[PDB]
Amino acid sequence: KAGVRSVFLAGPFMGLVNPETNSMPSAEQLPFLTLIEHFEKQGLEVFNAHRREAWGAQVLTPEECTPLDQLEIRKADVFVAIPGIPPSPGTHVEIGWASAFDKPIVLLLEEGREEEYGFLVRGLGTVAAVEFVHYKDIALAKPQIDAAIRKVVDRVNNPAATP
Amino acid sequence: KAGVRSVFLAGPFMGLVNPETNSMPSAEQLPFLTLIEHFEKQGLEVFNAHRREAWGAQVLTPEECTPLDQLEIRKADVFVAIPGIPPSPGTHVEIGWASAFDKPIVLLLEEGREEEYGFLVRGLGTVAAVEFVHYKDIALAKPQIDAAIRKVVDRVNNPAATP
């Protein structure tokens, strides 16, 4: 229904950051905290993300981000990420993942970046349960993405043919 | 066995190219021709790639690259791509895809770039049937990747426990 038991959240990692280095925007992780908050607040366990490490030493390592990203991809109830052009490398992969994974999807289109994405973000929107929610202020995203979250989740969870 | 019925091949698309534009290296596509040749030559139907468009108007569009990339991901017998840092966006996604997809994997590590990847390329190497073949010359890759292709494919296709 409309009570995502667990929402997956990822960022452009490697991309947003340096090719396997540390340089993640605090104003970015913070936002994820706000959204991720409403998530753990309503009852949506936020998976994927690496908060801690994302706040102490983000840009994990393949032997960590890969295993957790994929495990979290299928361990997460609803796929919820954030573009963040460049074409979020970690996310995307986690996106295309959600594509084969089959796990619902919902990205926080980055008014502008989301546009740069298009490739698999848009392609995913048309091929698999992939919602596109532009966010110019997480303060408005939480609700926007949440609406397209329960809306897209309902459209892909409830019947598809005739009732 | 060692007769990949069809090999999937992709590039950093959007990444290697401009954010939804055209600027693909002829010296890059050409190589893909050589490799993709030995593929269609030995009996490995090269899927994914967009040759034509990749030679006339690459950087397809989500409504094309996404649907074909995913369909080709599961339509391809063996996943064979090429990093090409930046972290091939289109590929990666197609990579992570191959991760959940379960379809064998084999990337042509870009001596240096492949290193930049690490994130999901390496992460995939440890989590799923993902081989890492650095290539400083497709002329040597075809065979190198081909070896790690039948080798990795055999290791993931034949028994895993005791014989």
From TrEMBL, chains A, B:
<protein>
    <recommendedName>
        <fullName>Nucleoside 2-deoxyribosyltransferase</fullName>
    </recommendedName>
</protein>
